[PDB]
Write a protein that binds this ligand. Structure first.
Ligand SMILES: OC[C@H]1O[C@H](O[C@H]2[C@H](O)[C@@H](O)[C@@H](O[C@H]3[C@H](O)[C@@H](O)[C@@H](O)O[C@@H]3CO)O[C@@H]2CO)[C@H](O)[C@@H](O)[C@@H]1O
Length: 490
């Protein structure tokens, strides 16, 4: 995990063209001798602040710009300062995306916006309005298909509809984003989410739907439409689907308003290789042939490099991406953005699944998004601590299945570390009778520091023939507890 000199480790999301990026990397490993590793860990954007607080992680992190103000405020990013000559090569508005407190803190790579993607053979005339979709879906179910499937687990995909009639994240006022003026619970935001939940209520889509099943359903021709970004075009290309990319539908006569992201590359503050990273980025990646290499793996969208974008912009698909982008807004990059996104994620999931009403869900989102910074941090650190031990359960169950002659107290044997950034110690006792605990002692903001979160397993019972269950317990305050953890008792 610690950073090696004379070497570059790069993190980029699994849905981007990382193999293409590794090719720019293997070429770098030719003109310099400097090796390049490209990895795509799960939840890298969450992992990065965890590992880079202790001087670990990649030399270079790729993500949309909205997460980078948080990174910068937390101290984790070197200021990038390119020559004015290099800046002339990228559109000014992309540099604006990656400027925080007047300093640039990442290189902008590409501009992304969601579009309506549709099956031309199945649906030659896609709907201009969201309101058209229930009837269209009814028609399509009769033929054994569906009108629309997209990822309901990430708020990024439902935001264009929430924003259509007036939802907003943070109000921009007197030259700054007002972090206490949140627009996720106004009338327009309410009407947007209501329309989505009505779709689900009336069985035109399924609350369960995630990225993989929507992508699979579309690329196999089972659904006529999906909502996605340019990175998804590659997989459809290898499919038998004749698809188009077009303007998102309107809602109450209003354009859908996607939050537009700028894929960006940050340089780790603890990296020994800030100059090697700067040259890889400026003189290998951000060139026509570097971007082309990444693009032919998975399309980047409208790239920041003027020279290359001139060609790319002749693609009707990229013209559709930019049309949608113009109807939406470039995301803020302020630190409160992740609090906003986590708040809206829960709201959409809870409303869609029927656990809360739309008004209740958005009311709670408004409070969570406008919460004080330590509140968001405390919830995050507790969640992280829990994730740091949850992998231990499954492995514990495999050991119990073989049978134990002695209680197991080695957390390594469960695939766990003895400590993490969120857990000052991780301990375990997997008992011979199944009674067990895997315990995180939490470390971070004073609200949760030295509290415990743990998985508790009851004993199996051989006389009764019963198997013990797992329960998440914590002595953290109730309003800070994650979903499905309760308090402890004795
Ligand atoms: O939902 C919780 C989630 O919120 C935040 O994730 C947001 C991203 O920061 C934001 O950029 C956008 O992510 C999308 C990418 O821009 C796009 O390139 C592609 O990868 O799809 C992404 C969405 O799946 O939207 C998400 C919110 O959905 C936060 O950073 C995450 O840590 C958090 O898990």
């Amino acid at each position: 995990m610690k950073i090696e000199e004379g070497k570059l480790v790069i993190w980029i999301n699994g849905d981007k063209g990382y193999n293409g990026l590794a090719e720019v990397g293997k070429k770098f490993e030719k003109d310099t001798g400097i090796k390049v590793t490209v990895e795509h860990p799960d939840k890298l954007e969450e992992k990065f602040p965890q590992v880079a607080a202790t001087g670990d992680g990649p030399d270079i992190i790729f993500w949309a710009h909205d997460r980078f103000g948080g990174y910068a405020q937390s101290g984790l990013l070197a200021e990038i300062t390119p020559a004015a000559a290099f800046q002339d090569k990228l559109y000014p508005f992309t540099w604006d995306a990656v400027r925080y407190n007047g300093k640039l803190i990442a290189y902008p790579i590409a501009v992304e916006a969601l579009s309506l993607i549709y099956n031309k053979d199945l649906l030659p005339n896609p709907p201009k309005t969201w309101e058209e979709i229930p009837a269209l879906d009814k028609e399509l179910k009769a033929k054994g298909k569906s009108a629309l499937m997209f990822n309901l687990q990430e708020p990024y995909f439902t935001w264009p509809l929430i924003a259509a009639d007036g939802g907003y994240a943070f109000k921009y006022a007197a030259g700054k984003y007002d972090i206490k003026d949140v627009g996720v619970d106004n009338a327009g935001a309410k009407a947007g989410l209501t329309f989505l939940v009505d779709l689900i209520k009336n069985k035109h889509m399924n609350a369960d739907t995630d990225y993989s099943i929507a992508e699979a359903a579309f690329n196999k021709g089972e659904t006529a439409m999906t909502i996605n970004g340019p990175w998804a075009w590659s997989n459809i290309d290898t499919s038998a689907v004749n698809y188009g990319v077009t303007v998102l539908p309107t809602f109450k006569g209003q354009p859908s308003k996607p939050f537009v992201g700028v894929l960006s590359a940050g340089i780790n503050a603890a990296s020994p290789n800030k100059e090697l990273a700067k040259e890889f980025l400026e003189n290998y990646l951000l060139t026509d042939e570097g971007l082309e290499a990444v693009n032919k793996d998975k399309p980047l969208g409208a790239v920041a490099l003027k020279s290359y974008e001139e060609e790319l912009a002749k693609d009707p698909r990229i013209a559709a991406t930019m049309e949608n982008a113009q109807k939406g807004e470039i995301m803020p990059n302020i630190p409160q953005m992740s609090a906003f996104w986590y708040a809206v994620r829960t709201a959409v999931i809870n409303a869609a699944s029927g656990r809360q009403t739309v008004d209740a869900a958005l009311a709670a989102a408004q409070t969570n998004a406008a919460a004080a910074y330590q509140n968001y941090i405390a919830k995050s650190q507790v969640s992280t601590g829990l994730a740091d031990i949850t992998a231990g359960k499954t492995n514990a169950e495999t050991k119990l299945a073989e049978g134990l002659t002695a209680a197991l107290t080695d957390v390594e044997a469960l695939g766990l570390q003895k400590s993490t950034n969120a857990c000052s110690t991780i301990t375990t006792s997997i008992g011979t009778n199944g009674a067990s605990n895997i315990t995180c002692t939490l470390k971070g903001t004073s609200q949760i520091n030295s509290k415990k979160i743990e998985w508790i397993r009851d004993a199996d019972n051989a006389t009764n023939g019963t198997t013990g269950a797992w329960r998440c317990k914590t002595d953290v305050a109730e309003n800070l507890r994650p979903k499905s953890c309760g308090a402890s008792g004795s």
